[PDB]
């Protein structure tokens, strides 16, 4: 579970990709003119999924304040609220 | 929370009787990963951050910026440097005005 500021990038411009044990956020601009001049920008941020989550249970969403969140549940294998393997 | 292509940093411009100057916080880039292109009437500032480690996993960045050269500034003598703390700067010495021409013949 993790959060990243993306206010600099459009929601449409922003994309997230998950592959096995890794995550990849990617963004890009087109020389957008701000008060100081033209500002082209792009980046790639990555993360590793902890064993408490899997690449099929993950969720991704964006708040209006400009913060992207990558989320997943906590896999309780022992104690109360025990988990059960949903089979497809 | 993690951050990306932040530039809380911001660029600033100043004008004085001696020279023009513009600053850019590059706290996320090294001198070999940055390059400038003061075109005839422009001052481009680019950076290509490699896929290196950060406080959270690894991160990559790349960016282009463009500033326009003001009047009485010769692109031939514009200079640039990189202050510590992660901030670059472009200094463009300025000149004074000339005569009123006195050579503007007109037609009918």
Swiss-Prot record, chain A:
Annotated ranges, domain sHSP: 1-88
Residues holding Zn(2+) 1: 8, 36, 44
Primary location class: cytoplasm
Tissue and organ distribution: Lens as well as other tissues. Expressed in myocardial tissue.
Region listing for Disordered, in residue ranges: 71-88
Function: May contribute to the transparency and refractive index of the lens. Has chaperone-like activity, preventing aggregation of various proteins under a wide range of stress conditions. In lens epithelial cells, stabilizes the ATP6V1A protein, preventing its degradation by the proteasome.
The name this protein goes by in its record: Alpha-crystallin B chain
Upper taxonomic lineage: Eukaryota, Metazoa, Chordata, Craniata, Vertebrata
């Amino acid at each position: 579970s993790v959060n990243l500021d993306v206010k600099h990038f459009s929601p449409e411009e922003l994309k997230v990709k998950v592959l096995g044990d890794v995550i990849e956020v990617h963004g890009k601009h087109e020389e957008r003119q701000d008060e100081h001049g033209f500002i082209s920008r792009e980046f790639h941020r990555k993360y590793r999924i902890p064993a408490d989550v899997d690449p099929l249970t993950i969720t991704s969403s964006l708040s209006s304040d400009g913060v992207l969140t990558v989320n997943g549940p906590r896999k309780q294998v022992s104690g109360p609220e025990r988990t059960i393997p949903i089979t497809r």
